[PDB]
TrEMBL record, chain D:
<keyword id="KW-0539">Nucleus</keyword>
<keyword id="KW-0238">DNA-binding</keyword>
<protein>
    <recommendedName>
        <fullName>DNA sliding clamp PCNA</fullName>
    </recommendedName>
</protein>
<keyword id="KW-0235">DNA replication</keyword>
<dbReference type="InterPro" id="IPR000730">
    <property type="entry name" value="Pr_cel_nuc_antig"/>
</dbReference>
<dbReference type="GO" id="GO:0003677">
    <property type="term" value="F:DNA binding"/>
</dbReference>
<dbReference type="Pfam" id="PF02747">
    <property type="entry name" value="PCNA_C"/>
</dbReference>
<comment type="function">
    <text>This protein is an auxiliary protein of DNA polymerase delta and is involved in the control of eukaryotic DNA replication by increasing the polymerase's processivity during elongation of the leading strand.</text>
</comment>
<dbReference type="InterPro" id="IPR022649">
    <property type="entry name" value="Pr_cel_nuc_antig_C"/>
</dbReference>
<dbReference type="GO" id="GO:0006272">
    <property type="term" value="P:leading strand elongation"/>
</dbReference>
<comment type="function">
    <text>This protein is an auxiliary protein of DNA polymerase delta and is involved in the control of eukaryotic DNA replication by increasing the polymerase's processibility during elongation of the leading strand. Involved in DNA repair.</text>
</comment>
<dbReference type="GO" id="GO:0006275">
    <property type="term" value="P:regulation of DNA replication"/>
</dbReference>
<dbReference type="GO" id="GO:0006273">
    <property type="term" value="P:lagging strand elongation"/>
</dbReference>
<dbReference type="GO" id="GO:0043626">
    <property type="term" value="C:PCNA complex"/>
</dbReference>
<comment type="similarity">
    <text>Belongs to the PCNA family.</text>
</comment>
<dbReference type="GO" id="GO:0070987">
    <property type="term" value="P:error-free translesion synthesis"/>
</dbReference>
<dbReference type="GO" id="GO:0006298">
    <property type="term" value="P:mismatch repair"/>
</dbReference>
Amino acid sequence: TLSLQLPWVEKYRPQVLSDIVGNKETIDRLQQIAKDGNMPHMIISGMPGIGKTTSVHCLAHELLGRSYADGVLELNASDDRGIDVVRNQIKHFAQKKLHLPPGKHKIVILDEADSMTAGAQQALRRTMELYSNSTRFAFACNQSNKIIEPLQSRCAILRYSKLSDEDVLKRLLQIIKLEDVKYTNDGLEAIIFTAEGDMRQAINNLQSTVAGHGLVNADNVFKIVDSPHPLIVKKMLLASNLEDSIQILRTDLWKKGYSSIDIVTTSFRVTKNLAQVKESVRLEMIKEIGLTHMRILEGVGTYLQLASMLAKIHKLNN
Amino acid sequence: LPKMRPFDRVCLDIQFRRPDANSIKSRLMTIAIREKFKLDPNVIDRLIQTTRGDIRQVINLLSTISTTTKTINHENINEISKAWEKNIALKPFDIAHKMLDGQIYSDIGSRNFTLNDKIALYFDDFDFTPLMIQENYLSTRPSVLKPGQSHLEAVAEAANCISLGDIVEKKIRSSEQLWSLLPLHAVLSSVYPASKVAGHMAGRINFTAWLGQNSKSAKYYRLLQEIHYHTRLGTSTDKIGLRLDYLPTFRKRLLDPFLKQGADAISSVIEVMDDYYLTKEDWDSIMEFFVGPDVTTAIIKKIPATVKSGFTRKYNSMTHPVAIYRT
Amino acid sequence: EKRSKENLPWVEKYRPETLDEVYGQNEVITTVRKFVDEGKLPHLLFYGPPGTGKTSTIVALAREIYGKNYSNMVLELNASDDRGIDVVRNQIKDFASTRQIFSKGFKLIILDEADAMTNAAQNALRRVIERYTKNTRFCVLANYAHKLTPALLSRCTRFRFQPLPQEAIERRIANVLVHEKLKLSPNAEKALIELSNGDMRRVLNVLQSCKATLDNPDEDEISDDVIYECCGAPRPSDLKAVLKSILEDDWGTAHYTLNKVRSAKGLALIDLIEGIVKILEDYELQNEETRVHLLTKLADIEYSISKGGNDQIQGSAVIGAIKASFENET
Amino acid sequence: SMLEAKFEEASLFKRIIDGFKDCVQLVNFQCKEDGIIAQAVDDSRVLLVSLEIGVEAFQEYRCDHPVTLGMDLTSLSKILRCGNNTDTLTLIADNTPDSIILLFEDTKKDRIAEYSLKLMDIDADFLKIEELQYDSTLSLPSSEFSKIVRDLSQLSDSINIMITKETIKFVADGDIGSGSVIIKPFVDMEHPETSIKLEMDQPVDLTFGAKYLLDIIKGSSLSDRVGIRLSSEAPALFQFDLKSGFLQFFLAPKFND
Amino acid sequence: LAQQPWVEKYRPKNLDEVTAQDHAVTVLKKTLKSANLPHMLFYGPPGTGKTSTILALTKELYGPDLMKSRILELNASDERGISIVREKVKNFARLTVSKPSKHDLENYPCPPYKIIILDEADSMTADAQSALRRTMETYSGVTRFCLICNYVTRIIDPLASRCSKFRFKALDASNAIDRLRFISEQENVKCDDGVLERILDISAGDLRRGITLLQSASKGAQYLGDGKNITSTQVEELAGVVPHDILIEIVEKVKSGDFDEIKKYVNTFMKSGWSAASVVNQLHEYYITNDNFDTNFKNQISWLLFTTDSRLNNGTNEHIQLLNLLVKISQL
DNA sequence: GGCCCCCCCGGC
Ligand SMILES: Nc1ncnc2c1ncn2[C@@H]1O[C@H](COP(=O)(O)OP(=O)(O)OP(O)(O)=S)[C@@H](O)[C@H]1O
Ligand SMILES: Nc1ncnc2c1ncn2[C@@H]1O[C@H](COP(=O)(O)OP(=O)(O)OP(O)(O)=S)[C@@H](O)[C@H]1O
Ligand SMILES: Nc1ncnc2c1ncn2[C@@H]1O[C@H](COP(=O)(O)OP(=O)(O)OP(O)(O)=S)[C@@H](O)[C@H]1O
Ligand SMILES: [Mg+2]
Ligand SMILES: [Mg+2]
Ligand SMILES: [Mg+2]
């Protein structure tokens, strides 16, 4: 009862660039670079769980073959990446003499580079510039604005897009066929709808289902995976009448265990990204939501405050 | 940047500009010919517009795109330009100029520059944007005024929103450290007040003057505290009361008799100083506080130099009591 | 602990030790039991409000997985401990990358109350979680999801703990009565559930207070009056009378009735406002602005009360707000 | 008093306390008639320290009933530092004690220092973790082990130990390079203290952290020889024998993947 | 003693001297024989007897000998940051209980746990508060927590859920008259009928203020040296209560409706030093209790008074707020 | 190797 089974996220983690779905142009470009060699400095940006770390790892593995152990230097947020580390260990790795095939180069993979300090990024500039004939740099980040401009200038840009429904669905069919999982169309649609483009969350939900209920359907997925609360908040904020909004808040948000602070924050974000509403009305609703948030942060996290905020928003939009 | 201040007048300053689209056309065409990929000249400028003067970035872009796409024409220039757009945080002056523009707040502009974009623009520099907005929101010609609304009403609404944002900021930097309210401060301090007076600037953009005023007020408060604690043993009042009530009466005894008796009032002034444990530096600080029609700079300057020299000699030729020891 | 478990508070005395003693979370309990019965245990994120039983559930799961000697085979870190970037970098990484000591098994890390952790630590934990997944599993317990980074949320399977249902609270109350040899009137039970708001800690605390209040628990039955006296909460009849007087009677008699009701048992104004809000939420109003005014003015009054001030003025304001809001009905 | 333990020299207890203070924080002592035992688990739950001191290490020892004492090693070390290195140290405890009394007495003078440390409520068991039949055992001088550990920790943070036919290998793989040290058992009849002994049942290959080994070798001042016992699917044992007791470090090997 | 204020001299020493907090005092007394005291959260208005109650409970539980070694008290006058909570409170809670002496075990129950009293808990930051959630639960068997606050909303939800809540009711003339009368007899203070009731009504749930007013009145009577009984007019004067005549003039000026006259009268009135809160309370009483005004007037004036009180509670200028309130009332 | 001290972010 102590022998853990490898999760499908790691068990079915792609090992070749042909198993990565989405961002077709970038994947083919990476495959062509790996085939032809001469990998340039690159920065890959995108939202979590879309296949950036997997892409860079597969590229490095395919490029370096058996020399992966001695030709790859991987550093992430869980390791010390201070200015001294950049100044000593990275420089030593770049200056290292390693015999490689004619079309290959040493690779430094600085994952989650958005958390690095400014000093390390500044010090890395000439390190990449001088030793570009032996070592190449591949950064993986979630926010591209956290990387200093000089580093972006010295590196190519690869902005990963959001995984389409078709790609996630195809990967789901492939993994289900490999695992021989009994499924229904509605269950897969619900899983993809709840994933919101996050492949990792989709895999986790697909495993939890079948791992807990056997067969995949809408009810089985929904009894363990809840619908994203941002959609419920948007529905509440767009209610035609105050009664409907109050009912939605009471039934789907307050009685389901969601905290008031989370509700007000989600309302703030949704109002921030409501295109259908006019900008001035959105600003007034943002002001009211900020007043409610300030009241909640002071200690009064009561449903009365949320109801009053909804009533004021309805009055403003009338 | 302030770190470069020491290098102000010790080196020959050489400034490099962003190369024009015509100074690199030949080099880029030569590179395209050498690498055997077609590069349409008519779309070259946009590439620089995409890279914004970065020859290294455009060279890297060409190298990456030529890996699988051997033709660079108008059919795919838009996609690569959108995908390779460089994002650089705007400076406070640029932030103020862009945020106070009425185009982005229109129905058509809002769909291009959204509320999230404005919040990100504020967050590019969150320590200066509210000050610049508060300073430069009175020098615009609004174009988004509501039918029947006047400029003054919009200014008043913006000022009220700025006050609310100031309250929010004070709550943010309290002992609780409620930084999660920073996005709200973006709307109440910069976005909303600018949305009511957005338009075209009526003049040059001026940097916020609140910092210098705050420093001057802090220095004045320090001098007032020094004077108050120097005269504490004699007076029964606080520094506020000393400034509001005592200082004019003191001027009536420490500056007025120099303008009537000439150099014969030195003894009385010295006696007053001894009675209230005042010094010459305290005299200068006190005479520098007055404002309005009671400015003393011109009056002090017009005093004959002989009188001032005699007063200084008399002050330095005798011992004076000290109120506070080892200040 | 000291002496015996009888000296412990009821909140801690009745802490579940196994998974079958957790009530109101049948779906989650069954899912975790199935996960631990066949070896497929993923990373867990228990999100829920206070008093739902997340800590008890994870403790029971750890005990079932490992056994009696579970404290020495798991790494439990909470807000009471220092959890910084250095701690995550060194201690958590060593625990995840090292084999067991006492007996063979996988490594379990329980980051209780992880919502109070810095963003740097959460960012660092991503690769620690994704690298030692083969031999280590992570469980994170949270009350506010907005404090967790999206990257951390993506790597964990989410389980939501709903407020305790009525039947679960009744079953726990019956068990507590059997253990403590106590009798509870049905109306007292309904009042306890109504005031509980889905928190079992409140149930246990109020029940202990009521037991202490009884002159002799051996042959005394707790009634709604006992619960109201212990908690000081207004009775439903008092709330109904106050609302009736405010709605139909004039100013002077309404003020007199409110003062008399408050002074009879030393009731607090905030509880009266809350009860009036609950009662009026079920009123079939014919207009919307009346409800808008009621909600806004009552929220303003509650916010003012939270900061203190004159109580008589606040009560008069409540009466005036209710009267003005209901005037719009016509 | 109920429990009264008299030490020949305060340094005797001070050296053992200093031998494992830098790897664990909270300690639990069980005092009985046979002697004093203690087990401490570090925060990372990787290293376990087990100390036993017999009655032969005490001048006068009396313990009517078992006593459980929870202490903070930092506080105990501070109090021991407050005491001198030439006075007699006495451990004093009473029934259900809320504190432990350390008595420092000087024979030359009439100065008596009585320090009281408030005890700690640490409810835990010992579990007597010790594998009956280890795969391999070896014994070698402590100085050589400390030198090898310090040399191989300068190259990398991980050290791999391999036990095979008539040979022990320590390997470190790092960024600047790698290092290997191979030692073969031999017996010397003129300096027996410098001999190295090895008895193996199956070949072993186990990886350990460099920091834990560095902290373990700090107990080289309590003994001249160290016994290292390795076994698959079992923590590695590092034993330093004392005058009448012993000290043991149980270190869990790193996961192999 | 004679060198202490009456508020401190007559501070309760045991649990039997608490007057109007029986709903919690009974539970606390029962815990003496039950020995299962839970974590407590004492909340209520100022001057209700929370710190006194907890001190009396600790005394009756441990004794003057074990009080020092079994109680750890932290208030707003000590640093209570997150680091302090994580280190000092954790260390004290995890410590073993001090060994009682046979004397204490003979004459006192000596419960097998210690008490940490976090007075003025409403001033602690949320981050610091969050660090105690597991500290209270893990060491509940050796330590118990008492959190005393005036605003219950300032305590985070998890701590309120963990703690057993105890509300202290306001001390009015209907439940605290006995203690004030006993204090008066002990001090041999002679007062006219209804004087103590007037004092308690003016106090409005604050027995400390009532005791201070009684002490001031007794001092004034002793200095007078006439032997006459203390009247209610002198008590009202000592309490800063505006005379009824001034209130009558104020309401007449408000009824006049002229802005200039109201402003001039307010300017003259503010030179006497009357507190704005007392004026607002008296105006509210007079207007609400009067039967010469219609429903709408009272409906508007209640909200106006509430807004004025809320603004004054934030520490603003009294002159401007009073003038604005009077102007608004005059236009009703 | 360990304190002690100074500068700098802090939303998505
Ligand atoms: N394009 C993809 N195709 C197939 N599986 C994917 C893909 N992207 C993600 N996954 C799956 O999700 C798992 C995690 O993918 P990741 O590489 O960790 O995503 P990520 O974008 O690098 O996450 P961040 O930004 O570091 S938090 C993979 O092992 C895959 O099993
Ligand atoms: N499902 C439950 N069944 C029985 N008792 C419960 C249950 N949930 C909570 N309790 C009781 O309330 C006490 C506290 O439960 P907890 O496990 O601490 O709740 P919690 O969700 O961990 O609180 P938070 O989210 O950390 S503030 C338990 O000892 C139980 O006595
Ligand atoms: N229930 C009471 N019984 C007798 N005297 C009381 C009572 N409450 C307050 N007092 C008296 O008023 C004095 C002060 O009481 P406190 O204990 O300070 O009230 P408090 O609740 O602690 O006020 P806060 O909320 O900390 S400002 C006591 O010394 C008593 O003399
Ligand atoms: Mg990744
Ligand atoms: Mg918990
Ligand atoms: Mg008090």
